[PDB]
Amino acid sequence: DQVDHIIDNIEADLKAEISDLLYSETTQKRRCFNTIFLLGSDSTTKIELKDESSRYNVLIELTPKESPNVRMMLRRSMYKLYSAADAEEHDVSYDLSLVENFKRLFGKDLAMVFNFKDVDSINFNTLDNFIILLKSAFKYDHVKISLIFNINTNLSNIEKNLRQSTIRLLKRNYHKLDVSSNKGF
Amino acid sequence: ILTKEARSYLVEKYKELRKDDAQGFSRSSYRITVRQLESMIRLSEAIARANCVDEITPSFIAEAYDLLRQSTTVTYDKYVSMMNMIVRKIAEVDREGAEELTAVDIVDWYLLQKENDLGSLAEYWEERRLAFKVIKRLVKDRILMEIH
Amino acid sequence: NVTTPEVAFREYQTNCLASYISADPDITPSNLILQGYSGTGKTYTLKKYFNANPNLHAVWLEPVELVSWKPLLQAIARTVQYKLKTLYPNIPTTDYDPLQVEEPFLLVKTLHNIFVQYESLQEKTCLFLILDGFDSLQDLDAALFNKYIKLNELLPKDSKINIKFIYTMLETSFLQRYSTHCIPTVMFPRYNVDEVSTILVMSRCGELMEDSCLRKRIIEEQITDCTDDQFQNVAANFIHLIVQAFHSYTGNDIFALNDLIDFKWPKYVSRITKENIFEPLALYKSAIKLFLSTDDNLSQTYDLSIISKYLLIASYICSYLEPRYDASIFSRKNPRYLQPSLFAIERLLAIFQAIFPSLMKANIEVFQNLSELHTLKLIATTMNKNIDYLSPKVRWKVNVPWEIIKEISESVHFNISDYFSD
Amino acid sequence: NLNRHIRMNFETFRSLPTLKNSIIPLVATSKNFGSLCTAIKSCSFLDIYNKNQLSNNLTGRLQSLSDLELAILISAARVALRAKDGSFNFNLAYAEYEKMIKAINSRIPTVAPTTNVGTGQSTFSIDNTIKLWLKKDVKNVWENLVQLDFFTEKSAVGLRDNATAAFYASNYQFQGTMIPFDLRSYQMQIILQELRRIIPKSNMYYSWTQL
Amino acid sequence: ETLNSHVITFMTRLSFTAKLFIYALLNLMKKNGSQEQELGDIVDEIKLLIEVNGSNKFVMEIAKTLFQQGSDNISEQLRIISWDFVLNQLLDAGILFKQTMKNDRICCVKLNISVEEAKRAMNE
Amino acid sequence: PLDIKLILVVHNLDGPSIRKNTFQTMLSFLSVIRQIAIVASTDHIYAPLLWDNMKAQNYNFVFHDISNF
Ligand SMILES: Nc1ncnc2c1ncn2[C@@H]1O[C@H](COP(=O)(O)OP(=O)(O)OP(O)(O)=S)[C@@H](O)[C@H]1O
Numbered sequence A: 001d002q003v004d005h006i007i008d009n010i011e012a013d014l015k016a017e018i019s020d021l022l023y024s025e026t027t028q029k030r031r032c033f034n035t036i037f038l039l040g041s042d043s044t045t046k047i048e049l050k051d052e053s054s055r056y057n058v059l060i061e062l063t064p065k066e067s068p069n070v071r072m073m074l075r076r077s078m079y080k081l082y083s084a085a086d087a088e089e090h091d092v093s094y095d096l097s098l099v100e101n102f103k104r105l106f107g108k109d110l111a112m113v114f115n116f117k118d119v120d121s122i123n124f125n126t127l128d129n130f131i132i133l134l135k136s137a138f139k140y141d142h143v144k145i146s147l148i149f150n151i152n153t154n155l156s157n158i159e160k161n162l163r164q165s166t167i168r169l170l171k172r173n174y175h176k177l178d179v180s181s182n183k184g185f
Numbered sequence B: 001i002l003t004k005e006a007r008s009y010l011v012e013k014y015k016e017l018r019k020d021d022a023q024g025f026s027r028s029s030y031r032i033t034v035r036q037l038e039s040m041i042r043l044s045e046a047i048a049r050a051n052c053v054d055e056i057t058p059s060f061i062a063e064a065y066d067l068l069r070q071s072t073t074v075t076y077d078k079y080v081s082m083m084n085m086i087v088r089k090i091a092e093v094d095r096e097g098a099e100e101l102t103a104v105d106i107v108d109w110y111l112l113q114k115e116n117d118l119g120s121l122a123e124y125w126e127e128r129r130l131a132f133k134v135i136k137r138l139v140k141d142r143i144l145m146e147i148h
Numbered sequence C: 001n002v003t004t005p006e007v008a009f010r011e012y013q014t015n016c017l018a019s020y021i022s023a024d025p026d027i028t029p030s031n032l033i034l035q036g037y038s039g040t041g042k043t044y045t046l047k048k049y050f051n052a053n054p055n056l057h058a059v060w061l062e063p064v065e066l067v068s069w070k071p072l073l074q075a076i077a078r079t080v081q082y083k084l085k086t087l088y089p090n091i092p093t094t095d096y097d098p099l100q101v102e103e104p105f106l107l108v109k110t111l112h113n114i115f116v117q118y119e120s121l122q123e124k125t126c127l128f129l130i131l132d133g134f135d136s137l138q139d140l141d142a143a144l145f146n147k148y149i150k151l152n153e154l155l156p157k158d159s160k161i162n163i164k165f166i167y168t169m170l171e172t173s174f175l176q177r178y179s180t181h182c183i184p185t186v187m188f189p190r191y192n193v194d195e196v197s198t199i200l201v202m203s204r205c206g207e208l209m210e211d212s213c214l215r216k217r218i219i220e221e222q223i224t225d226c227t228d229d230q231f232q233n234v235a236a237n238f239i240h241l242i243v244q245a246f247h248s249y250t251g252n253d254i255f256a257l258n259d260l261i262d263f264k265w266p267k268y269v270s271r272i273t274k275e276n277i278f279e280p281l282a283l284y285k286s287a288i289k290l291f292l293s294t295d296d297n298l299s300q301t302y303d304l305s306i307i308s309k310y311l312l313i314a315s316y317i318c319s320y321l322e323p324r325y326d327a328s329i330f331s332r333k334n335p336r337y338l339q340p341s342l343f344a345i346e347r348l349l350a351i352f353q354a355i356f357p358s359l360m361k362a363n364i365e366v367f368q369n370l371s372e373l374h375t376l377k378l379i380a381t382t383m384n385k386n387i388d389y390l391s392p393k394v395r396w397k398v399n400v401p402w403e404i405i406k407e408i409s410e411s412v413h414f415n416i417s418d419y420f421s422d
Numbered sequence D: 001n002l003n004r005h006i007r008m009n010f011e012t013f014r015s016l017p018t019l020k021n022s023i024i025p026l027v028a029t030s031k032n033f034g035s036l037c038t039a040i041k042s043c044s045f046l047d048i049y050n051k052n053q054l055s056n057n058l059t060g061r062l063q064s065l066s067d068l069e070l071a072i073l074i075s076a077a078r079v080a081l082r083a084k085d086g087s088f089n090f091n092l093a094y095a096e097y098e099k100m101i102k103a104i105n106s107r108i109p110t111v112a113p114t115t116n117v118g119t120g121q122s123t124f125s126i127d128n129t130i131k132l133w134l135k136k137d138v139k140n141v142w143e144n145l146v147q148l149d150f151f152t153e154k155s156a157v158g159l160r161d162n163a164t165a166a167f168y169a170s171n172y173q174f175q176g177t178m179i180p181f182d183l184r185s186y187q188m189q190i191i192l193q194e195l196r197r198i199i200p201k202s203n204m205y206y207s208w209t210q211l
Numbered sequence E: 001e002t003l004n005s006h007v008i009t010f011m012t013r014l015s016f017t018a019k020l021f022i023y024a025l026l027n028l029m030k031k032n033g034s035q036e037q038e039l040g041d042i043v044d045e046i047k048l049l050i051e052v053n054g055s056n057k058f059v060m061e062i063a064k065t066l067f068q069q070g071s072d073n074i075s076e077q078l079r080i081i082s083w084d085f086v087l088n089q090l091l092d093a094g095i096l097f098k099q100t101m102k103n104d105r106i107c108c109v110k111l112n113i114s115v116e117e118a119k120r121a122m123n124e
Numbered sequence F: 001p002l003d004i005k006l007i008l009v010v011h012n013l014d015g016p017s018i019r020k021n022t023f024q025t026m027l028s029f030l031s032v033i034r035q036i037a038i039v040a041s042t043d044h045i046y047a048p049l050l051w052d053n054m055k056a057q058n059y060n061f062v063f064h065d066i067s068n069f
Helices: A002-022 A070-087 A097-106 A124-139 A155-161 A164-170 B006-019 B034-051 B058-069 B076-095 B103-113 B121-140 C011-020 C042-050 C069-087 C104-120 C145-149 C175-181 C193-208 C212-220 C228-250 C255-270 C280-291 C306-315 C348-355 C364-376 C402-412 D002-012 D016-029 D033-042 D044-054 D059-063 D067-082 D090-106 D135-147 D163-170 D192-198 E007-011 E016-032 E039-052 E057-067 E083-092 E115-122 F021-031 F053-059
Strands: A034-039 A055-062 A109-116 A143-149 A176-178 C033-035 C058-061 C125-131 C161-169 C185-187 C379-381 C396-398 E096-098 E108-111 F006-010 F036-040
Touching: A002 A034, A002 A176, A055 A070, A070 A097, A070 A109, A070 A124, A097 A109, A124 A143, A124 A164, A164 C255, A164 D135, B006 B034, B006 B058, B034 B058, B076 B103, B076 B121, B103 B121, C011 C042, C011 C185, C011 D016, C011 D044, C042 C161, C058 C069, C069 C104, C069 C125, C104 C161, C145 C161, C145 C175, C175 E083, C185 D044, C193 C228, C193 C255, C212 C255, C228 C255, C228 C280, C228 D067, C228 D135, C255 C280, C306 C348, C306 C364, C306 C396, C306 C402, C348 C364, C364 C379, C364 F053, D002 D016, D002 E016, D002 E057, D016 D033, D016 D044, D033 D044, D059 D192, D067 D090, D067 D135, D067 D192, D090 D135, E007 E016, E007 E115, E016 E039, E016 E083, E016 E108, E016 E115, E039 E057, E039 E108, E083 E096, F021 F036, F021 F053
Parallel strands: A034 A143, A034 A176, A055 A109, A109 A143, C033 C161, C033 C185, C058 C125, C125 C161, F006 F036
Antiparallel strands: C379 C396, E096 E108
């Protein structure tokens, strides 16, 4: 009982800190998705979102298994987010068009967040190409994106593999939030 | 003798002349041992005997070190000497909090520097043009960053 | 007869583009190749040309936002049909399914069906279809560029409307494969440093003179009310400064600079005072502590444990030590540079049990931390991701560079300079 | 002149539509008759046209690079030259670059006196005087290069025959993915000998193109 | 007309650049006895062939044009003009046959036609 | 509530199919469930190579020797 007590304590702590840091960071640039790194992340940490009526908050989770190439990542993600817009909504191209049509096709503006489940094993060239792809979505202004990196460890490992020109795209507003059951005990 | 505090200097310098050598992984140098340090002592002393001056001064150690370490454009040594003197000058002006330094101020700084250059005024006109060539060259180079 | 605009560094290109493109579909060639590397403003000079000449008609596509030629075709179809519906609201029309086309010939048939009905036009008119970055399509093949070149011929010659393409591409290693077609092309060379600074300042003064942080610090400091030029002066000065100080690091990019500027502008603002605004010199001499390092990084004492430290430090030993020597230098009685050779299991365990400080024979925590490693992708397998944990043909190799090896060695106090000898 | 340009095209290209592509702008660009007559009498516009057509195949690229890029390039070419297969890692390029910078500093008189006017604290000891860039930053220049195609992967099939083989090669879960950034053995596209012929000798690294 | 080919009567009509390319390739074939050359190696051989002749004003003109269409304003080309273009004009014409490597200095090149007929074509 | 609602047992957990890392991870996230009893066995002497601390945490393996030859 005391075990599960402290367990739920730490769990609610993690959910709270991530939900907090996910918002309130009004960065006047507003042309680059904000990134949230999870240092030492177990990659098993579930995430919740604000209900936030008048704007869908759709979570997207990508596994290193879901990522054979760029095209299939894009399609799987598009299908997932479209199914979620349907569940919130009650013929569509699995592509970027679904973004801008989104408003016309669902009314409320969109705000997605990507949760790369276990990044260290994904082939970083693919992920890089995918991020450069996503960058194009910033010409519609009815959507905003945010990234949730679940690095297993070693932020240096990540910044060793990506194209530096894309790091300089992520580095717009990052937050080195840690998620480690082992920290100062 | 080594009475000048170049002594201390020399010690530190030898350090890097070991560090720059990186045989394997912190494995001993091929080319340099402590005998080379004793050699630096002797080379210094010998340069002193050359200039006919006792009590080796750190600049001597510097020359001995660089001589021991080896293995448009105009006469290369002259250009690099211009570079060294001008950079020292600008560093001193930096430390002293002096206001600024202009190209013509530097050319007159050399006017100061090389008067035993001698020759003729024609030479001065020529050496002046050379100085301007060199300073604009550094500009075109990336040594000192310009302003305004 | 067309109004050629002016661009700060596209004079020749502006002229030749307005020369290869006009209203008359007859004197307008079929295709066109705006070539050049990313950072020359093709997507911008072309836009600033079209906005100067609105009488004509164009479509703008983003081949990078699409992925393959299938969505490419479908998007071309939908954009063309909508553009025509919105270009002549009067003519009745039957829209064809843009999601029906899946083959390059289906596209031609559909376009023919779309154009045959517009034969009520008063004159031959052009339609410039812009593909912005036909190179960067993630599934390019040798047989796509010509596939799109040839659509001019298949389409009827006397249609009231004339589709004319404008391709955009980079990596001249691609355009070379199609020289013999002799399609007219324009090249955009990358800029020199000075013109880079010019473009950058004239494009970002509007951002920096009126950004939030500087204007804030205006009232946040002694007011010292001044004219717009003072902010112009200081902004342009910072621009020349950052570019002349980071050029050698960034090259002749325009985007990388448009990132460094925004990463180093807020702090630079913070390091301004009441006086330096009329003195860029001391302003620089004060803010210096940033001008000399990218700070674009956002050796770690890896969380891993003792047994893991030794596992890793032993699995590194055959990045130079082939099994020919290990049983010699490790018995119980330079390839530091090159990519590491492949281990095999039970050799790792061998060297481990050797250099672990008879003390330990248990292997549950050992393999536990081994799997931990392999999840951290520090010692990855050349073979697949699922059968590695059998014992089929399978090789293991370290994916950590040598500096972290030095770190792990010193921290664990075991020395490694021995086992490497040359 | 026009005759000479025609002859040039004939000897090199021997292809009319090429010359046609050259003519189209020269004619269509003019605004008055006298200007066009001047042009066709001098055909100067053909010069700029040839140039721009030629602008950035392989030499213009080489010319539009700053100092540090050129240094990385030269040093990497030297490393490729040493090894037989030309295959050079990134680490090798960096090590050779570092020792080249060490050399450039070495041949500088390297005066570092310590004394000065009493309690002066002046007479600084600047000796390196070349900002040897770190491993952490060069990676930027390395990516810039590898995407400016001065380099290439060891053996990479550039563009397959058709979308069939291309798609069958995209399904290939590659393993060079798994090898880190600084081990992909890049082979060379511009060899050191040629490199010596283009870098203008004014550049302060020109004396390293030649070994 | 149902027997005679045209490859001979064709190659006697290619651009001087193409004939230069082919003749260099044949020199390489007999020099290395491998009937397989490397593309950049062929470029080196073309440089050879241009420079083995003296500084003759005519060799001067050749060097100039073949490296820059006059107009010293723009000059100093690495590989000869139209070289990509003539390479392709050969390759697609089935004469030359090349493998596919994006690295354009170690890619192989082979003649599909007989060496003999090519040599004869050079002899006219 | 906490009671076994199904008992699964794997013969040769190192099998040519179950050992596939995908199948292994699926069975891990499965064995996280409390109301199920997980009991299995292997033959591969290298069994511990299969599970990281994540998969062990999922499994909470308790070991027992059974040698009957
Ligand atoms: N002559 C110019 N005048 C003003 N702004 C310019 C000029 N040249 C480039 N720019 C700016 O630089 C940006 C680069 O535009 P792009 O065309 O996207 O660059 P690029 O070379 O096309 O690379 P891309 O986008 O991957 S195709 C433009 O959007 C402008 O903001």
